[PDB]
Design a binder for this molecule. Structure first.
Ligand SMILES: *Cc1c(COP(=O)(O)O)cnc(C)c1O
Ligand SMILES: *Cc1c(COP(=O)(O)O)cnc(C)c1O
Lengths: 378, 379
């Protein structure tokens, strides 16, 4: 099985590229004196996380309890569920912990901390809960210098007989930046807010062994991480065009592409039609907001060579329109990409495109492939 | 019995009553037009959903992948139109489906694809049935309706080659760019007129063309006459969505698909409620952002699924939805107006994109009880 024999579209991981990505991130975190806790929401795949663990990762972060089940059943026990804890999901969290999953939960309100602690007391479980900090006004979390809410939550947890294990933050606004200076200042803001919260917890005599920060861009841009114990990053494993435009990788580093077959043309308009539509690429159009818009993806040849100036300018559910970015009509598009030619499309957003497929085709050095299943749903 | 209260979130909820209204209405329209209805299962990829389309009077189905064709044929459907231009490397799979008794139709829009099909047909003693895709509106594949030389060259390649030239089809997909009953009617007429024009030119040259197949949900509902057409193809109608609502072929109250979600927190001063349906649940689809009304990541309804007006998902991260006022003002006591643990239902931008985020649907009955309806994922 190789790139010529796969049915298309198919999500291809280039292993050499994935390995270089995994190594770059780990050596960076080593140099920073910090643990790396990869976010598996990018791949939801056991063998991709195994590769991250083999290079030195510690534990994982997950976006759903379903991911936690999957990775636990496959042997990972150090699992951070980094999404504000819904009380109704407490039974399921407890069941994971009682089965031996060292599952960590997060909260950002008093009421949520109250429900966890009461359930904990009622069930005889000291849940380990971390407090989410908001450092860039981007999602959930406790304002970095809203100490009263911080300590009120700290107290609810610690007085309540739960384990207050740390603070975390995720500076998601990284995604909107596109310079080294601004990413650097954003990473520093992420570090300082998170550490400031830790120290305020410790000043009030509450424990706070874990200080957890990160997004892929802040992970790669931070000049210093004093006071941080771990960084969480996920999308870096494959990279994607949004990250390329952010400035933290080149298009060549993108390890995930979508293998597509040319099924037709509109010669007239210089279009080649591929069987990779938005069902394959997903509807994500993150690069439309950035300084270089790649439509529904950057075209590469079968070998993985980027072909600048050809992108998917359009997409329907099961067809994509391959055409010139400069909007001119390619002359003789049919003779350039005859019926049946296979190409590889780089995604806007690796997390979104990977979710369209039941599996990855992992491409090894000899041109051979291995199917790596991934998780779908909740 | 699982209810909207016991289910986990996010969950794709089909209101069965609403779905049934949608199925009744579309079939009726086509009966009134004297045309067959060949439902496109790509919206749903779900056997029971197509059971109820066929129950209502449908004939055969349209699939968007040969995996859909595998799945429906296994479940007993034998009359299947694979309506994406045929890739030659897929020919063994198409052959094998036909050999097991699937009456599978293929489509092409070029001479080269017709030659490939016909050579493999010859080598394998299989007279494939092939239809010619017609471009009537410029947004995708197809032979131009007035491109008689290429039509005749494709038709003769199929026919001289021993294959069965079964018909022409077109799909006018620019119906989403429109929003008035007059523009929809003109576009449906243009779709009808081009497809029939193409069928008449094959016939005038002596080639068979007994099927003339048109359709998009909006055009199937808006067409006043369908002379010359033998079948209509419509899919998203089964559930509707906000793009459809915005286009004008249904109200928000006919949308049968919703995403059940739970409030997991707030940003007080910004007037935010946080829900566990981010773009992973909704999909990244934002079809409503270029239309008369923007619903960001979806219209917020309550548990019983009535529209709460002016509350939408204004942003979405992967597993986090941002529930705010569409008008961009910051709601006072958002936290009292949507308390932690409250479950809501979100109407989707695009039902085809939303349902594909789920392994299954939760098909909600009269009595408040749901049932898991699996749907297909992948290729
Ligand atoms: C996604 C995510 C990360 C990793 O972010 P990327 O930029 O996707 O690598 C870390 N922490 C949390 C809470 C996340 O949701
Ligand atoms: C999607 C599709 C339809 C049905 O269109 P909706 O407007 O989505 O119901 C019909 N024909 C073809 C070829 C399609 O791809």
């Amino acid at each position: 099985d190789t790139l010529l024999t796969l049915d298309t579209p198919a999500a291809v991981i280039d292993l050499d590229r994935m390995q270089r990505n995994i190594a770059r991130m780990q050596q960076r975190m080593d140099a920073q004196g910090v643990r790396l806790r990869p976010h598996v929401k990018t791949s939801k795949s056991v063998p991709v996380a195994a590769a991250q663990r083999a290079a030195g990762a510690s534990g994982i972060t997950v976006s759903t309890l379903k991911e936690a089940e999957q990775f636990f059943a496959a042997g990972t026990t150090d699992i951070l569920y980094a999404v504000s804890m819904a009380p109704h999901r407490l039974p399921q969290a407890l069941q994971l912990r009682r089965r031996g999953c060292d599952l960590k939960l997060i909260v950002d309100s008093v009421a949520a901390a109250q429900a966890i602690a009461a359930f904990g007391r009622e069930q005889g479980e000291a849940f380990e809960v971390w407090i989410e900090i908001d450092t860039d006004g981007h999602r959930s979390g406790v304002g970095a210098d809203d100490t009263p809410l911080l300590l009120a939550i700290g107290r609810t947890l610690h007085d309540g007989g739960m384990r207050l294990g740390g603070v975390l933050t995720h500076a998601g606004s990284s995604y909107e930046l596109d310079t080294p200076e601004a990413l650097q200042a954003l990473a520093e803001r992420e570090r300082a807010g998170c550490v400031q919260a830790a120290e305020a917890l410790r000043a009030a005599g509450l424990p706070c062994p874990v200080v957890s920060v990160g997004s892929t861009p802040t992970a790669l841009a931070a000049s210093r991480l004093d006071g941080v114990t771990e960084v969480r990053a996920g999308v870096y494993v494959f990279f994607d065009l949004v990250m390329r435009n952010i400035g933290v990788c080149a298009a060549e580093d993108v390890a995930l592409s979508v293998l597509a077959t040319v099924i037709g043309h509109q010669a007239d308009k210089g279009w080649a039609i591929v069987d990779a539509g938005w069902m394959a690429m997903s509807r994500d159009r993150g690069t439309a907001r950035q300084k270089q818009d790649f439509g529904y993806g950057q075209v590469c040849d079968l070998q993985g060579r980027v072909m600048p100036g050809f992108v998917l300018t359009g997409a329907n559910q099961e067809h994509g329109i391959l055409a010139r970015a400069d909007g001119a009509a390619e002359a003789d598009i049919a003779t350039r990409f005859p019926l049946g030619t296979r190409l590889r499309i780089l995604p806007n957003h690796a997390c979104a495109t990977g979710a369209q497929f039941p599996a990855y085709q992992a491409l090894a050095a000899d041109g051979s492939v291995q199917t790596w299943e991934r998780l779908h749903g909740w």
